[PDB]
């Protein structure tokens, strides 16, 4: 099984400031990582697929980067609607695994 570590668990940031989440795999998984968003009492929402490929509907602020073991989810100028838990999930080797999750705080 591929372990997905997200540091830190909680990420504090001022409004209108660029922020970056981290996702590290225990082994190289190429670019087969996917980012999701989950607000309070809500269902997960796909933000970025395959490291950097954007999804229709998701704001331009959400970008993606990284390859191999290190991956990064970035938000250009964070606003109040981005308060949620951010998870990462790999699809390189069976079974699929999720990250520990990172809670954004403004």
Contacts to its own copies by CB under 8 A? 1, 3, 26-28, 65-68, 70, 93
80 CB-side CA count, 13 A: 0
Q: Residue 40: exposed, middle, or buried by beta-carbon count in 10 A (0-12, 13-18, 19+)?
A: exposed
Question: Cis bond leading into 2, ω under 30°?
Answer: no
Residue 67's DSSP bridge partners are: 70
The site string for other proteins over 2-21 (x = CB under 8 A, - otherwise) reads ----------------x---
Nearer to other proteins, 12 or 28 (CB): 28
Contacting positions for other proteins (CB under 8 A): 1, 18, 30-32, 34, 36, 38, 41, 43-46, 49-52, 63-68, 72, 76, 85, 87, 89, 91-101
């Amino acid at each position: 099984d591929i372990l997905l570590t997200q540091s830190p668990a909680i990420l504090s940031v001022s409004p209108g400031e660029r922020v970056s989440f981290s996702c590290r795999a225990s082994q190289s998984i190429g670019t087969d990582i996917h980012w999701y968003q989950q607000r309070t009492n809500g269902s997960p929402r796909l933000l970025i697929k395959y490291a950097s490929e954007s999804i229709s509907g998701i704001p331009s602020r959400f970008s993606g980067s990284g390859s191999g073991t290190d991956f990064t989810l970035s938000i250009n100028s964070v606003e109040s609607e981005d308060i949620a838990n951010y998870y990462c999930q790999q699809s390189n080797r069976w079974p699929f695994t999720f990250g520990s999750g990172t809670k954004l705080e403004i």
